[PDB]
Symmetry: C4
Subunit: 31 residues, 4 copies
C-alpha cells in the first residue's frame, strides 16, 4: 500500500520533470 | 484515514494528465 | 504522521489547481 | 517509507513552486 504509495509519487515526480522540459521549449518558441 | 490518500493521488495524477495536453496545446498554438 | 501526508497531497492538489488556470490564460492569450 | 514519502512530497512542493514561478514569466512576456 505504502510502497505502492511512494511509487505513484516517483511517477508524479517525473511528469513534473517533463513539464519543465516543456516550459523550456515554450521559452524557445516565444523568444 | 488512508483510501483518501490514494484517492487524492489518482486525482493528482489526473491533473498532470490535464496539464500534459494543455502544454501540448500550448506547443501547438506556438508551433 | 498520516494526516501529514494527506494535507500535503492537498497543497500539491491545489497548486495543480492554479496551474491549470495559468495555462488556460496562456492558452487564450495567443489564440 | 515514512521519511522517504515525505522526502519526495517536499520535492514536488518545491517543484510546483518553480513550474509556477515559470508561468508567472510566461505571463509577463505574453502581456
Amino acid at each position: 500500500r505504502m510502497k505502492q504509495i511512494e511509487d505513484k509519487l516517483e511517477e508524479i515526480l517525473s511528469k513534473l520533470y517533463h513539464i519543465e522540459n516543456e516550459l523550456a521549449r515554450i521559452k524557445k518558441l516565444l523568444g
